[PDB]
Specification:
The structure is cut from a larger assembly and holds 3 copies of chain A (51 residues), 1 copy of chain C (48 residues) and 1 copy of chain D (78 residues).
Chain A: E1 2-3, E2 10-14, E3 17-32, E4 42-50
Antiparallel strand pairs in A: 2-3, 3-4
Chain C: E1 7-8, E2 18-19, E3 24-25, E4 37-38, H1 43-47
Chain D: E1 46-48, E2 54-56
Antiparallel strand pairs in D: 1-2
Classes of the chains: A mainly beta (51), C alpha+beta (48), D little secondary structure (78).
The structure holds calcium ion (2 copies).
Organism (chain A): Western equine encephalitis virus
Protein name (chain A): Structural polyprotein
Subcellular location (chain A): Host cell membrane; Host cytoplasm; Host nucleus; Virion membrane
Chain lengths: 51, 51, 48, 78, 51
Amino acid sequence: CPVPLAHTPTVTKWFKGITLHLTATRPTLLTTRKLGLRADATAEWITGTTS
Amino acid sequence: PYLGFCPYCRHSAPCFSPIKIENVWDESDDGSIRIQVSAQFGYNQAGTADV
Amino acid sequence: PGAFGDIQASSLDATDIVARTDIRLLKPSVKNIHVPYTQAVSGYEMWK
Amino acid sequence: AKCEPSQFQCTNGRCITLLWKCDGDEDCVDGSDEKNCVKKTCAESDFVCNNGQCVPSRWKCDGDPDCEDGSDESPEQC
Amino acid sequence: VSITSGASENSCTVEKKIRRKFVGREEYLFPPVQGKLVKCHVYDRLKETSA
Ligand SMILES: [Ca+2]
Ligand SMILES: [Ca+2]
């Protein structure tokens, strides 16, 4: 099944952290996880544009 | 006129089509919408104006 | 990109319009000729 | 090799849509798109030479031979 | 499901939640003309196949 690719998110960088810039016309699943001992894993159904 | 490649066809899959919708504007407060389609309306086969 | 004024111009009938929509194009991967234009939805809409 | 479409790779060295093997179009550099599947040789736009060979229907009785039996130029058949 | 023959014109309905669904991680109204291909499942329209 063909599925869309949400616009490639722009990223901003800062001391020990980043800010993703997200732009999706429709509900798009975002997820992230750390590769450390803890997962700190999170997910969010981002909508529209946000950071 | 011409023929294009609209995302969804009569059948639920991509196809080439004479009535490929290009763009759609809905800025009018009336809720009406302008539709730009590959097919031409109001022109004769030879291109005579005929609504 | 995506902020107000993502596109700007001297006036509506000017040819010196600039922008920073962050438009990017992927490879035309599908069999049919198509251009995968993708971008931040207009900052004008976000501001609206 | 492992690839995202989960579908056959031909001598082109790329994974390709296996449904294109009977889409009516040869996509791989090899004539694989007609090797392993049932096909309508003639669409409603096409003329069946009486042997079952298929050519664009406009090729029938147009002036020159097309299929291996010449049905595309058969006077009686025109 | 219904018969519309005027005379034989009965019908039937059943309560069944049938919301739109979308394989992948992005909500999409229609399969996008372009994008990534992902493994999905569909009902094979070939009448001979056996479920
Ligand atoms: Ca093919
Ligand atoms: Ca001929």
